Amino acid sequence: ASPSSELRRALEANEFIPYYQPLSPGQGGRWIGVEVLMRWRHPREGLIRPDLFIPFAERSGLIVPMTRALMRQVAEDLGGHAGKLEPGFHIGFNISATHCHELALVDDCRELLAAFPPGHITLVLELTERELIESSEVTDRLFDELHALGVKIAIDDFGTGHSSLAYLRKFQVDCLKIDQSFVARIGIDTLSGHILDSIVELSAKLDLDIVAEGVETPEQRDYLAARGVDYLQGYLIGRPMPLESLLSSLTVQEQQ
Ligand SMILES: Nc1nc2c(ncn2[C@@H]2O[C@@H]3COP(=O)(O)O[C@H]4[C@@H](O)[C@H](n5cnc6c(=O)[nH]c(N)nc65)O[C@@H]4COP(=O)(O)O[C@H]3[C@H]2O)c(=O)[nH]1
Ligand SMILES: [Mg+2]
Ligand SMILES: [Mg+2]
Ligand SMILES: [Mg+2]
């Protein structure tokens, strides 16, 4: 057996599929977006989560084609249900570092946005703070074109890496996403009370939006709301879910 072969097989069989984790406002209300999370519906093993296959996919050279397939499926899934999404609804994708050195990303973003009415969604690209993009004239160009499309850049896993204020201006960052490890420490450890505050301060200084991830408890939610966190994501709000479940919930909220 070849793992690379098997990934190419899975991709050709459209086995990489999107799950959707909702984002809600800091002060509560109806959902304001989703993060798209890849899953592998494997014929024999069931639904495999991405920490089990994305690293291999990155090594193999297949992550870009896999991401493109995911963005195309999301357009197919949600592009015909714009009426269920309040204008400005965020749709976020995790982008691998290789994809950021490829001007093709601009075309993939354009294509996704074309599946919805103009300005109706906000496309967000999430770049992990753990792997800081090495800038070049290509990245300069790419991020300028993405910004001109109206795409937003989020830095996720935030607080776990070592980005600088200069890097945040360089890649035109719109949003920080606080890693779930910091949220998990609310009401338990002082140091991360300080780390979490320090991220909030950085975001107010640079006028960035903040999403807090891993929000599992009301304690956590209230703590984050009291510090002006814009958006919350976590099992308290909603686990990642298949399309049918997302549509069911959106219909309910559309109704209220
Ligand atoms: N226990 C707990 N977990 C929570 C909570 N809130 C969110 N999570 C989980 O944390 C992960 C959030 O995405 P991430 O930090 O980008 O971390 C992601 C991301 O780095 C990567 N990944 C997922 N989808 C893609 C993709 O489309 N492309 C690429 N390149 N990477 C992806 O896989 C990682 C893991 O994804 P998932 O397994 O879907 O796991 C998701 C989500 O289900 C919570 O309250 N409690
Ligand atoms: Mg994704
Ligand atoms: Mg993410
Ligand atoms: Mg994270």
Residue numbers in the entry: 5 to 259, 261
Would you copy out the relevant sentences from the publication that reported this structure?
DGC domains containing the signature GGDEF motif synthesise c-di-GMP from two GTP molecules while EAL1516 and HD-GYP171819 domain-containing PDEs are responsible for the hydrolysis of c-di-GMP to 5′-phosphoguanylyl-(3′-5′)-guanosine (pGpG).
We determined the PDE domain structures of MucREAL and PA3825EAL in complex with c-di-GMP/Mg2+. The structure of PA3825EAL in complex with c-di-GMP/Mg2+ shows a different dimer interface to MucR, named here as the “closed dimer”. The β5-α5 loop moves towards the active site and contributes to the formation of metal binding sites via two highly conserved Asp residues (Asp160–161). The restructuring of the β5-α5 loop and the functional role in metal coordination is thus conserved across different dimer interfaces.
